[PDB]
Design a protein around this ligand. Structure first.
Ligand SMILES: [Zn+2]
Length: 46
């Protein structure tokens, strides 16, 4: 199962999605936001 060598890098917080890194955790989490659907469902109107 895709048991290949695609993901080298020992970091505390890395956005595997793109390949970035953030000292803090929140930074990475908030960033991952762009790596997922963000349709205007809540009280937001785009
Ligand atoms: Zn990213």
């Amino acid at each position: 199962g895709s048991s290949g060598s695609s993901g080298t890098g020992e970091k505390p917080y890395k956005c595997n999605e793109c390949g970035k890194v953030f000292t803090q955790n929140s930074h990475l989490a908030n960033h991952q936001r762009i790596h997922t659907g963000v349709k205007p469902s809540g009280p937001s109107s785009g």
